[PDB]
Design a protein around this nucleic acid. Structure first.
Ligand SMILES: [Mg+2]
Ligand SMILES: [Mg+2]
Ligand SMILES: [Mg+2]
Ligand SMILES: [Mg+2]
Ligand SMILES: [Mg+2]
Ligand SMILES: [Mg+2]
Ligand SMILES: [Mg+2]
Ligand SMILES: [Mg+2]
Ligand SMILES: [Mg+2]
Ligand SMILES: [Mg+2]
Ligand SMILES: [Mg+2]
Ligand SMILES: [Mg+2]
Ligand SMILES: [Mg+2]
Ligand SMILES: [Mg+2]
Ligand SMILES: [Mg+2]
Ligand SMILES: [Mg+2]
Ligand SMILES: [Zn+2]
Lengths: 83, 177, 116, 66
RNA sequence: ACGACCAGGGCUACACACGUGCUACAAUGGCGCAUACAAAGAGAAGCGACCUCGCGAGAGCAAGCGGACCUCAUAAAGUGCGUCGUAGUCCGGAUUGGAGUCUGCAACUCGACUCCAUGAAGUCGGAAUCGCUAGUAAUCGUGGAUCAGAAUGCCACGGUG
RNA sequence: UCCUCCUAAAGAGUAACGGAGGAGCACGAAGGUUGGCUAAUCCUGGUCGGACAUCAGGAGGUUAGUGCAAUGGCAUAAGCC
């Protein structure tokens, strides 16, 4: 993982979109290609449509979803089985 | 009979208060404790039954009654009359002294003990629990034994309801939860 | 010879029979015996019961069998309930850490499953 | 009770690490030294402490400052 | 547009089959402490002492070096003493959880390493099959290229033999 | 050849190449006596333990049992120790 001295990581355009949806108080799904951004505690309660390579799957943000990144909730390989 | 004296002096006064019974004979009381080991594997060998009865004879100092099959079932490959388990009925002072050694020694010797259930009172006050492993009693030597048995305890009391027995064991600080 | 719920073999040494505890290893067993002042070359035999009580207090300083198994199951079911990639790997039975599943995933996948 | 078929059931003393000296009737014969008793078992404090969920937001804010 | 630009994903998937390798199943050994003997290489957007802090990977300050000068860099196997005493073990280390470091805009998919805990299979391998004739096989470590980072592969080096 | 039920018409008996089933034994205790006991099934709770072993309680009240076919009996048990 990343060093603590660097802190977390998040895209600036994402942190501005979070700050906008916070101040506006709108619950629109934020579509986002930032699969590498760590979730912040101010992101709790938002639908964020994480890209997977092909489309945007919506992720409601939970308390437990704080210390992770957005890509963990957007699986990129679809596998059902061989038979 | 130490807990029997503690029953007779403080539990009856407590329950008469917390239920507002008309008579003192209306209070619950414990009647018997039954110690079963269902040994369905003794059809393989008698020695497993014969040694499981030896361990439980050490727990409660009575010779166990070897129980047999009431009828025959084929899913278990048993016939009517095979010795299939062992039981011990405990009454009186030997009941109270086992119940003291139980709630004082053996329940703390449970691995990962985290409480009992209050949902095991068979709708009519009679409590039933089952232990996974006989080594929680200190009567059994750990090197000397070879096979992990298990038994089940059935406390039969005179409480009509389920809560009057729950309050009775809680008056004996029985670790429900 | 009975620490933290379970029994402990007497013929082995101190650090090893302590390492029989689910939650300690040779490191933490050295930290236990160093905090109890007990030499490592002694057995669980020829120990004072006061030394074993000091040992029980030192083991009680850490997280062990029932607590540790509860915490491990809580972390796994936290990933299960989140539905992250690690949760999906934990419930598909597949390796979590990014290993290969084309070949050599036999620890998580068990023995071979023949094509029928 | 019957006479011979039963094992010996004799009053002995069982002392514990919390110093809970307790005399019980048992089939052990020798005296007993315990590890935990019902007085000193962590059923009333330790199992309550041993859940220990902890917070994820608090972990996040703990790891740094803005 | 079968051309060009960008983000994200993929080339790392997984009922399975094969090839080439690594580590093992231990006592001709795992352990701990002490200690002896190498060669050949690389280094400036680099190698990075000493000292301090950290259990640690590492961090800070910071000399010296375009290098028979300085650095990578203490060779390990070995030997001496004690230890385990045949067990799925003080063998084996997979797997998984938690805490971290570093590189790099950025380690979710998808990095390496460290610490604590965890401790699978495996007790010498069916039919079958491979390499090797002497400083060889076997075994033991070392270095380099590629490379921000990322080898059990490759290319080289000496030790025992 | 023998047993049981129906046909068989409320005493007995009563036929058909009429309708349905069994027997050609067993037991030295599965007999005698004294003493005692009372089922099937289901519900709940409960270690391994599972639809179903054993254990405790409750409903039920013979729907069970009778060495074997059926019928008639059987709690004073003819049933079970
Ligand atoms: Mg351990
Ligand atoms: Mg791209
Ligand atoms: Mg490829
Ligand atoms: Mg090892
Ligand atoms: Mg050596
Ligand atoms: Mg040694
Ligand atoms: Mg095996
Ligand atoms: Mg072996
Ligand atoms: Mg590199
Ligand atoms: Mg290089
Ligand atoms: Mg060589
Ligand atoms: Mg007539
Ligand atoms: Mg007539
Ligand atoms: Mg008869
Ligand atoms: Mg009679
Ligand atoms: Mg049941
Ligand atoms: Zn105590």
């Amino acid at each position: 993982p990343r060093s603590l001295k660097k802190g977390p990581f998040i895209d600036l355009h994402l942190l501005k979109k979070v700050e906008k949806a916070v101040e506006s108080g709108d619950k629109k799904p934020l579509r986002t290609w930032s699969r590498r951004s760590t979730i912040f505690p101010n992101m709790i309660g938002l639908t964020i449509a994480v890209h997977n390579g092909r489309q945007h799957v919506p992720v409601f943000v939970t308390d437990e979803m704080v210390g992770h990144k957005l890509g963990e909730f957007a699986p990129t390989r679809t596998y059902r089985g061989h038979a | 009979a130490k807990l029997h004296d503690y029953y007779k002096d403080e539990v009856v006064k407590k329950l008469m208060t917390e239920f507002n019974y008309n008579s003192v004979m209306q209070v619950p009381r414990v009647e018997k404790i039954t110690l079963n080991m269902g040994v369905g594997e003794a059809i393989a060998d008698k020695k497993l039954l014969d040694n499981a009865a030896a361990d439980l004879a050490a727990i409660s100092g009575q010779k166990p009654l070897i129980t047999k099959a009431r009828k025959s079932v084929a899913g278990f490959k048993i016939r009517q009359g095979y010795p299939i388990g062992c039981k011990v009925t405990l009454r009186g002072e030997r009941m109270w002294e086992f119940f003291e050694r139980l709630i004082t020694i053996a329940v703390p010797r449970i691995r990962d003990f985290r409480g009992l259930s209050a949902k095991s009172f068979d709708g009519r006050g009679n409590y039933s629990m089952g232990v996974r492993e006989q080594i929680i009693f200190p009567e059994i030597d750990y090197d000397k034994v070879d096979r992990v048995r298990g038994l089940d305890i059935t406390i039969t009391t005179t409480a009509k309801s389920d809560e009057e027995g729950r309050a009775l064991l809680a008056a004996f600080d029985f670790p429900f939860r | 010879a009975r620490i933290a719920g379970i029994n402990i073999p007497d013929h082995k040494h101190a650090v090893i029979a302590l390492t029989s505890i689910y939650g300690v290893g040779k490191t933490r067993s050295k930290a236990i015996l160093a905090a109890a002042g007990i030499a490592e070359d002694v057995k669980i035999s020829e120990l004072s019961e006061g030394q074993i009580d000091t040992l029980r207090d030192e083991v009680a300083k850490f997280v062990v069998e029932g607590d540790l198994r509860r915490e491990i199951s809580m972390s796994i079911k936290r990933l299960m309930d989140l539905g992250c990639y690690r949760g999906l790997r934990h419930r598909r039975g597949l390796p979590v850490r990014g290993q290969r599943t084309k070949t050599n995933a036999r620890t998580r996948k068990g023995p071979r499953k023949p094509i029928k | 009770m019957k006479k011979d078929i039963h094992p010996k059931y004799e009053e002995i003393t069982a002392s514990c690490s919390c110093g809970n000296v307790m005399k019980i009737r048992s089939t052990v014969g020798h005296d007993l030294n315990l590890d935990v008793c019902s007085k000193c078992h962590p059923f009333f404090t330790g199992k309550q402490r041993d859940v220990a969920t902890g917070g994820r937001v608090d972990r996040f804010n703990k790891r740094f400052n803005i």
